[PDB]
Amino acid sequence: DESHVTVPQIGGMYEGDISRKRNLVEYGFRLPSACDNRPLTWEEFADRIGQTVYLSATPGPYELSQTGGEFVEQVIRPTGLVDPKVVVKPTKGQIDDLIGEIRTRADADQRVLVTTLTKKMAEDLTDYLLEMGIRVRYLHSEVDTLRRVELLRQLRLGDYDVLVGINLLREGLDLPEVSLVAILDADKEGFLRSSRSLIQTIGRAARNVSGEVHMYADKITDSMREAIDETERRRAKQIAYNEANGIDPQPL
DNA sequence: TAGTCACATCAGTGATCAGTGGTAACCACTGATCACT
């Protein structure tokens, strides 16, 4: 499940653990048996697995290469969930528009998630945007469990309206009342900011009854536009399916 | 540098009971002085 971030997680975790295991065994901390005591490498994983089934919100490049591109699509939600609308704007000239949109939308008392690249201008935005009169919360690189479980509690208590985070946002931060999400200058190359994070934020906005993404780029890359195109076509398919399945949801 | 990434094991740390450390008659005596005839 969530293979798009599970298989890359397996690879990266194996790489990091084998690096630290070399740093241990070579520098006298553990035996090479501890190096053998490791998460499964992908070669031996393939050598050991049988009928392998993958499942994720997005088609992983490794899975697509392994399967040749032929997959099965079931991302359509009979429950009535659609992908978010997309607005693309330049990086500059956006703060006034954001303030106007949050003033117009705050009557619903929802939450808006924003992202940046590194810490300095991110925190500059945070203290400025708490200065001009909006309650804001931020995420850092060393977020512990309590400091955002309390964030979840106080957002279900409706104590603020906006969250900002760079990397501490893809792990279990589900919220039933997040409508608009802003992506700021993520077009630049990064080992931790390629297309999967943008599609993950798109899906996070999608899980709402009415999502929205505001995407700011100095330059346009093929990955983001292909992701937007596939998201839009999937949303069109979901809307077409839901137009026939007009029955209201009946949870059971 | 990303959320977890395997696996218990030492240190001297309060409060308090628990269970090692600290516990005048009798009138029996005999003598002195003495009340008595």
Side-chain angles (χ1 to χ4, degrees), chain A residues 9 20 141 168 171:
Chain A
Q9 178 191 102
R20 81 199 53 191
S141 71
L168 270 296
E171 331 90 345

Short mmCIF file of all heavy atoms in Angstrom, two decimals, chain A residues 9 20 141 168 171, chain B residues 1-5:
data_model
loop_
_atom_site.label_atom_id
_atom_site.label_comp_id
_atom_site.label_asym_id
_atom_site.label_seq_id
_atom_site.Cartn_x
_atom_site.Cartn_y
_atom_site.Cartn_z
N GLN A 9 10.80 4.49 -0.38
CA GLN A 9 11.19 4.43 1.02
C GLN A 9 12.04 3.20 1.31
O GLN A 9 13.01 3.28 2.06
CB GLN A 9 9.96 4.43 1.92
CG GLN A 9 10.31 4.33 3.40
CD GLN A 9 9.10 4.08 4.27
OE1 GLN A 9 8.87 2.96 4.72
NE2 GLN A 9 8.33 5.14 4.54
N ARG A 20 24.96 3.42 7.46
CA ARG A 20 25.23 3.44 8.89
C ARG A 20 25.76 2.10 9.38
O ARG A 20 26.55 2.06 10.32
CB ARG A 20 23.97 3.85 9.66
CG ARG A 20 22.96 2.74 9.90
CD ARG A 20 21.60 3.32 10.25
NE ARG A 20 21.15 4.28 9.25
CZ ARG A 20 20.11 5.09 9.40
NH1 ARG A 20 19.39 5.08 10.51
NH2 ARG A 20 19.79 5.92 8.42
N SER A 141 12.01 20.72 10.73
CA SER A 141 12.60 19.46 10.29
C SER A 141 12.60 18.41 11.40
O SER A 141 12.73 17.22 11.11
CB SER A 141 14.03 19.70 9.80
OG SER A 141 14.90 20.02 10.87
N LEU A 168 7.35 17.99 6.50
CA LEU A 168 6.58 17.29 7.53
C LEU A 168 5.08 17.41 7.29
O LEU A 168 4.32 17.85 8.15
CB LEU A 168 6.96 17.83 8.91
CG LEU A 168 8.11 17.16 9.66
CD1 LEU A 168 7.78 15.71 9.98
CD2 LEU A 168 9.42 17.26 8.88
N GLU A 171 2.80 12.72 6.12
CA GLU A 171 2.71 11.59 7.03
C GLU A 171 1.49 11.75 7.94
O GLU A 171 1.56 12.37 9.00
CB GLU A 171 3.99 11.45 7.84
CG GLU A 171 5.23 11.96 7.12
CD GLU A 171 5.50 13.43 7.39
OE1 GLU A 171 4.60 14.12 7.91
OE2 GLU A 171 6.63 13.89 7.10
P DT B 1 17.68 19.40 6.12
OP1 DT B 1 16.32 18.97 6.51
OP2 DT B 1 18.13 20.78 6.40
"O5'" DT B 1 18.75 18.40 6.77
"C5'" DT B 1 19.21 17.28 6.03
"C4'" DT B 1 18.12 16.24 5.87
"O4'" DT B 1 18.60 15.15 5.04
"C3'" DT B 1 17.64 15.60 7.17
"O3'" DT B 1 16.24 15.36 7.12
"C2'" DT B 1 18.42 14.29 7.20
"C1'" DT B 1 18.44 13.93 5.72
N1 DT B 1 19.55 13.01 5.34
C2 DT B 1 19.65 12.58 4.04
O2 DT B 1 18.88 12.92 3.16
N3 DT B 1 20.70 11.74 3.79
C4 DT B 1 21.64 11.28 4.70
O4 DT B 1 22.55 10.52 4.38
C5 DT B 1 21.47 11.76 6.05
C7 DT B 1 22.43 11.34 7.13
C6 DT B 1 20.45 12.59 6.30
P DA B 2 15.36 15.43 8.46
OP1 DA B 2 15.08 16.86 8.74
OP2 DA B 2 16.04 14.61 9.49
"O5'" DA B 2 13.99 14.70 8.07
"C5'" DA B 2 13.15 15.25 7.06
"C4'" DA B 2 12.93 14.24 5.94
"O4'" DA B 2 14.20 13.92 5.33
"C3'" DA B 2 12.35 12.91 6.39
"O3'" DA B 2 10.92 12.93 6.38
"C2'" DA B 2 12.90 11.95 5.34
"C1'" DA B 2 14.28 12.53 5.07
N9 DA B 2 15.34 11.96 5.90
C8 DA B 2 15.54 12.17 7.24
N7 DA B 2 16.57 11.52 7.73
C5 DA B 2 17.09 10.85 6.64
C6 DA B 2 18.19 9.98 6.49
N6 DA B 2 19.00 9.64 7.51
N1 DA B 2 18.43 9.47 5.27
C2 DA B 2 17.62 9.81 4.26
N3 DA B 2 16.56 10.62 4.27
C4 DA B 2 16.34 11.11 5.51
P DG B 3 10.10 13.41 7.68
OP1 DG B 3 9.27 14.55 7.26
OP2 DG B 3 11.07 13.57 8.79
"O5'" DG B 3 9.15 12.17 8.05
"C5'" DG B 3 8.44 12.17 9.31
"C4'" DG B 3 7.71 10.86 9.57
"O4'" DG B 3 8.32 9.79 8.82
"C3'" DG B 3 7.77 10.38 10.99
"O3'" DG B 3 6.77 9.37 11.19
"C2'" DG B 3 9.19 9.80 11.02
"C1'" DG B 3 9.31 9.17 9.63
N9 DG B 3 10.58 9.42 8.97
C8 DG B 3 11.38 10.53 9.09
N7 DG B 3 12.44 10.49 8.32
C5 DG B 3 12.32 9.29 7.63
C6 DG B 3 13.16 8.71 6.66
O6 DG B 3 14.22 9.15 6.20
N1 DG B 3 12.67 7.48 6.22
C2 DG B 3 11.51 6.89 6.67
N2 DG B 3 11.20 5.71 6.13
N3 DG B 3 10.71 7.43 7.58
C4 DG B 3 11.17 8.63 8.01
P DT B 4 6.86 8.33 12.41
OP1 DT B 4 5.49 7.83 12.64
OP2 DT B 4 7.60 8.96 13.53
"O5'" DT B 4 7.74 7.13 11.83
"C5'" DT B 4 7.94 5.95 12.60
"C4'" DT B 4 8.55 4.85 11.75
"O4'" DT B 4 9.57 5.40 10.89
"C3'" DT B 4 9.28 3.78 12.53
"O3'" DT B 4 9.41 2.62 11.71
"C2'" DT B 4 10.62 4.45 12.78
"C1'" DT B 4 10.85 5.19 11.46
N1 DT B 4 11.49 6.53 11.61
C2 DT B 4 12.43 6.93 10.69
O2 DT B 4 12.79 6.24 9.76
N3 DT B 4 12.94 8.18 10.91
C4 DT B 4 12.61 9.06 11.92
O4 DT B 4 13.13 10.17 12.03
C5 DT B 4 11.61 8.58 12.85
C7 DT B 4 11.17 9.44 14.00
C6 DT B 4 11.10 7.35 12.65
P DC B 5 10.09 1.29 12.30
OP1 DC B 5 9.55 0.14 11.55
OP2 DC B 5 9.97 1.34 13.78
"O5'" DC B 5 11.64 1.46 11.93
"C5'" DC B 5 12.11 1.09 10.64
"C4'" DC B 5 13.62 1.17 10.58
"O4'" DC B 5 14.00 2.54 10.29
"C3'" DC B 5 14.31 0.83 11.89
"O3'" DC B 5 14.57 -0.57 11.96
"C2'" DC B 5 15.61 1.63 11.80
"C1'" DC B 5 15.21 2.85 10.96
N1 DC B 5 15.01 4.11 11.75
C2 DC B 5 15.70 5.27 11.40
O2 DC B 5 16.48 5.24 10.44
N3 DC B 5 15.50 6.40 12.13
C4 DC B 5 14.66 6.39 13.15
N4 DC B 5 14.50 7.53 13.84
C5 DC B 5 13.94 5.22 13.53
C6 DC B 5 14.14 4.11 12.81
#
